[PDB]
Amino acid sequence: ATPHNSAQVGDFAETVLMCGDPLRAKLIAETYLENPKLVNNVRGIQGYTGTYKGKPISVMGHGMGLPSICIYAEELYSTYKVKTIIRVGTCGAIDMDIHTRDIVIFTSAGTNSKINRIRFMDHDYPATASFDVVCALVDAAKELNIPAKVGKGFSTDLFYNPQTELAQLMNKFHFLAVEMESAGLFPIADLYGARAGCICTVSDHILHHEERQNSFQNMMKIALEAAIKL
Amino acid sequence: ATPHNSAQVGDFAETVLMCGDPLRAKLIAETYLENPKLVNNVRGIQGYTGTYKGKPISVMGHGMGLPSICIYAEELYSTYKVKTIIRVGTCGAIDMDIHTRDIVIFTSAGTNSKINRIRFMDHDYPATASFDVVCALVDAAKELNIPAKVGKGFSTDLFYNPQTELAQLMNKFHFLAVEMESAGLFPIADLYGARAGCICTVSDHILHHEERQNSFQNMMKIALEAAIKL
Amino acid sequence: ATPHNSAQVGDFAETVLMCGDPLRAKLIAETYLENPKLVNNVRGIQGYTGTYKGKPISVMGHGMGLPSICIYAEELYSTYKVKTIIRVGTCGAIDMDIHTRDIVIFTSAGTNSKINRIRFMDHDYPATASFDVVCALVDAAKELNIPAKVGKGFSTDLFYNPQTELAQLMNKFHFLAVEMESAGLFPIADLYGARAGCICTVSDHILHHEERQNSFQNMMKIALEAAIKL
Amino acid sequence: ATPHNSAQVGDFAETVLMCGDPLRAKLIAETYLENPKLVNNVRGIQGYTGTYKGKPISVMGHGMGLPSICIYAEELYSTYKVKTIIRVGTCGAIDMDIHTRDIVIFTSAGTNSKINRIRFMDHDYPATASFDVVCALVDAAKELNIPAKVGKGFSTDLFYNPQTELAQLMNKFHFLAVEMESAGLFPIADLYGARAGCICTVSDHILHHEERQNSFQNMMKIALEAAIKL
Amino acid sequence: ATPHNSAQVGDFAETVLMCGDPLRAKLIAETYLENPKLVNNVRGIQGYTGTYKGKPISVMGHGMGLPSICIYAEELYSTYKVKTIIRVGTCGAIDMDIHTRDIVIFTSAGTNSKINRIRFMDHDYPATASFDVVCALVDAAKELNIPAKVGKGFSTDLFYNPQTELAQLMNKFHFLAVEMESAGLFPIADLYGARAGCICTVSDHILHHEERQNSFQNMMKIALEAAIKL
Amino acid sequence: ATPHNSAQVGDFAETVLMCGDPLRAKLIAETYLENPKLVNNVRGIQGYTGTYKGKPISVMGHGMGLPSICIYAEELYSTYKVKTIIRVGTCGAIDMDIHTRDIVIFTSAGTNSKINRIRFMDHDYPATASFDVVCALVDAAKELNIPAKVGKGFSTDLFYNPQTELAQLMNKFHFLAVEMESAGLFPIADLYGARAGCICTVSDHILHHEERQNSFQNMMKIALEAAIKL
Ligand SMILES: Nc1nc(F)nc2c1ncn2[C@H]1C[C@H](O)[C@@H](CO)O1
Ligand SMILES: Nc1nc(F)nc2c1ncn2[C@H]1C[C@H](O)[C@@H](CO)O1
Ligand SMILES: Nc1nc(F)nc2c1ncn2[C@H]1C[C@H](O)[C@@H](CO)O1
Ligand SMILES: Nc1nc(F)nc2c1ncn2[C@H]1C[C@H](O)[C@@H](CO)O1
Ligand SMILES: Nc1nc(F)nc2c1ncn2[C@H]1C[C@H](O)[C@@H](CO)O1
Ligand SMILES: Nc1nc(F)nc2c1ncn2[C@H]1C[C@H](O)[C@@H](CO)O1
């Protein structure tokens, strides 16, 4: 159907959970979904569709970086009529009060990428998570009573950032964590009148290096229950 | 105490409602606050402090534009130890599905200003409303059962914008409304580890010109009840 | 007539003196104008029209920051057919040879705002004071024999500037003082084939903190006599 | 050893061929390398190391987009002491005289990404392929007598580009093709005093949609023979 | 003494008239200066020093474009202790009310160059002519009673400008004429606490193609008399 | 024929060698060309046309800076139907391993100018030397067996650069040398479907100050022999 997806309209659920690691997407499908069926493996992206508590749900990799997820998210909303995309995964803590293993729900994401400026006449576009998705994630977190921090994220184009001062600047403004996709995903959902959100588990702290399964499994519970709520 | 405020630490409540029109700030104090006392009138900004349901609350003008509100908000958080600032007022609808008299609660605000780029190493800072404030405003709206749209706002530096295409672009990305302060307020609250939010009543639609009191009074109810919740 | 002005065409003189502080605009009207009449008080902006030496002249506030004065100046030139706008007020000295109480006449104004780039295809627009207005101000200064420094000003979007190095950089390039409106006013006057100028009294020095009435009154004399000359 | 590579120093040859599709990297290893051994599969990136004509050579995926390849290339040069990275793969033709199935060797690559500006003080960095690698690729092409076009490439951050006019602009300046990694790879090689190059087979034309194996196999021959020459 | 000047401190007068055409600088020296002596001809720049009405004055070419004049002007102020540089020459009319053969005195100059942003922390630097020089030029014009237009100029980096819309935009903002050096010269004079100005004769109109000696000679009279006044 | 060239179509050879110093262009014509005839001296640019080994070849100055060479190169390709332009001259070494008197052949050139961003929708244009010209220059160097370094150059708009850190940054990325024209020339050649290249002799090192004829003559040999090859 698309240059990066062999599936056809209908193969994907209206709600898709995405993570960077394709092998993680596979593990998520085998571990949390019932009757998971591989609907797309172009570039070994591991796109699966199954059910959770009887409801259709898909999980698929999205690569690393804004350019990668922008391709996948746009095709999903446009061609496969997906309605909600929830990014699930890991991130690097920024704020000094955020620690490894913490779970973070993004209200929005800043970025050092030029993509949003290109689509927004060189102005400041606020890459904002869909309010419904933020609410569903927070409520799921409250209902499951799992501690989660809600706040700004940052999507960097440079995992290895030459601008060593940025990290401290972001800590001063209290950015919670860094990843590489949210800032790109959110504006695309808006353009298609669809929804997007992001929830991550801190795998490390960038201002000082500091069980990882429990945190990851708790995050998956929140994302999954939230997907049902939506 | 400051170049723009004659009051001293303690004269302002920890929660301050702000609007552009100083005469509106005065009207709000006389109409909704009990025992309102003028605590600052430098530049006729009309800064009052009184109580609502027994709790201390201040209301004050903030001028028009990001540069103006940045001055007031920074002094309030820094010098007067204010904790929460809620911008209340009017805005221009962008989205075709948003209409005059509608009430909008900002999750965040985009901007064509350079202020956030200056404070954020020329990168994209997501001017995001404090999640607690967004929640308090939405809950107040739900409890009072007043219909309100939640979504992105846009703070323009140019009321009379030469870039006539921007309006349609924003409608495509579903920006809800335009005002001139939010994008500046939000990042300042973050820097001071404080809180900020914005709620407005659409006074007109910018893509087509289309009782105004009821809407304004309903908005004031939401802001006020939210202030108590916080 | 406009969203920020209740007056109608003809209520404003062709020459308008503007300052940020609305209460100062009121004081100027009562102190220097004869038969001053309030022609606009939307947002308590204090717009007055009277006469000086028999000639019609208006005085009105313009708020703080480029976005604010851009609104007022554009409406005045466009709707009220005003021909000349002279910004009168205070500023912060930059240059080491400029001192508090000094009077400065701007030849032009630099800025860290994005407004001029937006209206000038992202190029460098030289926010220049109208040569006629600069001349009228200097001649008035010479005729009244009041010492005044003529040179570049800087209109900042950030009263509290995070870029602490800018101040010293501007001192090296000999910027005379900082305010928050000129860079916005000048290009608007050009667009409407009208005129604009700026004259200020240094209320403080930003590189080192260092009677204020005499200086302010002397500045008002220059502006007023210049207004007559024009 | 690294967050994206489980291999240790020595597992990778000093020359690494990279492509976006991990499944293609696997196919290349099984088809052209002798005794190929999987040295890294973190994120299913398919990193293999074997020999070609007796010389050690590695092949591995690099994901889509500059942020992705920047991670992989920097770790390879820095941690695994790789000396030469040759990007092999597909691209979209831009120039009207370039056609589907054509083989293109990049002298350099332009981009709409902000990465190079971030690492080069906001100036214009010329993402240039290592001259040795360009020469090796061209000579291999000449020796194998396989027609190949040499010229500028373009690495876009947006596969689905909102700026529809860019394509025609690039055709006027004669950019040969578009991909999503070269502009990022080249500057990284320079920083590490290492080498990088790119060769692609046009899978389609972006200005008009227009056997694919022969072209791909011919490209692989050039890259492989060039790798030996280096 | 410098890479572009073989003269030594003292060979140049404190006032230097500069034009792009080296052959014009030579003609000016032979035609208006008494006892003109060649003090520098590196790169055939034709730097002369003589006297006008008994006062020392130099004339020299400066090449075309901001980068060229920046080299010459900086060396002159820094090494040769020159105090005033007056650019004399030709320009292209922009404004519809400006015509070929008209004489224009620049109050300032806009530009599409990046030089001023590089020296001014990426902000808007107002390339302003020294007020003393503008005054001297205008007074000379008034005393000689030669009609001259005073206003903004524009220094383009592109004689052949791809942005065909810029011309009309500048006409709307009433830029008087275009040349290629002023925007660079003015900020350099400021940095060295020196002076600079520009006066040109329109050789053609860029919005519509439309004796040339009289205009040029009249301009030279103004510049020369102004040089004496300074 | 053009505002900067009095010659007519046919007066210039299809191959033109250009240098900044007009007196050097004259010396090159008298020293290496047979029957050199002055075909253009507007602005004393010294444009000559003669023959080398029987083939028509022109040499002419181009001034200093991108704006200057852009004028000359565009007129030459457009009006005089020139096919190949080779910039010959001097440059300042950047890389620590490059020394004074070394000969450098540019594969491409970076820049701090805004010209390429203006012509390339504000994106990163890779100012690349024509591959044919790079090859001809390298082969000539190999055939004459003259040691020459091939790599990136940098065209600065500021000979006297305020950004003192740039030099070290460029050394880290291994830029070979700095000049002031290449970045402008290369994109123009592309637009006209023509060719351009650059070869220079290091006259000094910018990171530490460190016979000059031999190097210059060797460079001229390479350029000349290359011109014949093309
Ligand atoms: N500390 C960290 N920093 C950055 F920039 N990204 C982090 C991260 N931890 C996880 N991620 C997520 C985002 C990318 O897809 C991928 C990068 O390894 O995994
Ligand atoms: N349609 C509209 N457009 C913009 F730009 N701002 C609007 C508005 N309606 C209200 N506002 C708010 C924001 C400023 O403080 C002030 C500007 O009049 O009131
Ligand atoms: N030191 C100073 N710095 C800045 F930025 N602005 C100054 C000032 N002194 C006076 N002003 C003028 C301009 C604004 O309207 C307002 C800001 O208080 O008053
Ligand atoms: N027409 C085309 N346009 C763009 F932008 N990239 C193209 C392409 N054909 C192949 N590619 C390469 C680059 C990415 O890794 C990936 C994107 O599908 O494959
Ligand atoms: N119409 C025109 N446009 C531009 F851009 N520059 C003009 C000009 N007429 C004269 N000049 C001056 C400036 C350069 O030094 C040189 C360019 O030919 O002469
Ligand atoms: N060290 C150096 N730095 C820079 F920026 N340019 C250099 C140079 N050596 C020679 N050039 C060439 C380029 C200009 O045309 C002219 C500048 O003098 O000569």
Short mmCIF file of C-alpha atoms and ligand atoms in Angstrom, two decimals, chain E residues 19-21 62-66 87 89-93 154-161 177-181 200-206, chain F residues 3-4 43 67 71-72 75, ligand 5:
data_model
loop_
_atom_site.label_atom_id
_atom_site.label_comp_id
_atom_site.label_asym_id
_atom_site.label_seq_id
_atom_site.Cartn_x
_atom_site.Cartn_y
_atom_site.Cartn_z
CA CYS E 19 33.46 54.23 -4.48
CA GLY E 20 33.28 50.74 -5.96
CA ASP E 21 34.91 51.52 -9.30
CA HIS E 62 36.33 49.56 -2.17
CA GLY E 63 35.14 46.83 -4.55
CA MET E 64 31.57 45.54 -4.82
CA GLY E 65 29.64 43.97 -1.94
CA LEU E 66 29.67 44.10 1.86
CA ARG E 87 30.73 56.24 0.24
CA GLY E 89 28.78 56.37 -6.16
CA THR E 90 25.78 54.99 -8.02
CA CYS E 91 22.71 53.02 -7.00
CA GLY E 92 19.48 51.55 -8.33
CA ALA E 93 16.23 53.34 -7.50
CA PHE E 154 19.32 48.70 0.84
CA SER E 155 22.61 46.83 0.44
CA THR E 156 22.00 43.62 -1.45
CA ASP E 157 24.34 40.63 -1.58
CA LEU E 158 22.68 39.73 -4.89
CA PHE E 159 22.85 42.21 -7.78
CA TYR E 160 20.83 39.59 -9.68
CA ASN E 161 18.25 38.85 -6.98
CA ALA E 177 17.68 52.87 -3.60
CA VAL E 178 19.87 49.76 -3.70
CA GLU E 179 23.63 49.41 -3.61
CA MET E 180 25.98 46.84 -2.10
CA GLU E 181 28.12 48.32 0.68
CA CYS E 200 24.65 58.09 -4.46
CA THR E 201 23.35 59.05 -7.86
CA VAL E 202 20.67 56.78 -9.33
CA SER E 203 22.04 55.22 -12.51
CA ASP E 204 18.83 53.28 -13.20
CA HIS E 205 15.48 52.19 -11.75
CA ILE E 206 14.95 48.52 -10.92
CA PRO F 3 26.78 46.77 -16.40
CA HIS F 4 30.16 45.26 -15.47
CA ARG F 43 36.04 48.84 -13.09
CA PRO F 67 28.57 39.26 -3.90
CA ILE F 71 27.93 39.23 -10.39
CA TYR F 72 30.82 38.30 -12.67
CA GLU F 75 27.06 37.41 -16.38
N1 LIG G 5 20.85 49.03 -9.66
C1 LIG G 5 21.81 48.70 -8.84
N2 LIG G 5 21.64 47.59 -8.07
C2 LIG G 5 22.63 47.23 -7.21
F1 LIG G 5 22.40 46.16 -6.51
N3 LIG G 5 23.80 47.89 -7.04
C3 LIG G 5 23.95 49.01 -7.83
C4 LIG G 5 23.02 49.47 -8.73
N4 LIG G 5 23.46 50.60 -9.35
C5 LIG G 5 24.63 50.77 -8.81
N5 LIG G 5 25.03 49.89 -7.89
C6 LIG G 5 26.38 49.96 -7.17
C7 LIG G 5 26.59 49.00 -5.95
C8 LIG G 5 27.71 47.98 -6.30
O1 LIG G 5 28.97 48.37 -5.83
C9 LIG G 5 27.75 48.09 -7.82
C10 LIG G 5 26.93 46.99 -8.54
O2 LIG G 5 26.99 47.16 -9.95
O3 LIG G 5 27.35 49.48 -8.12
#
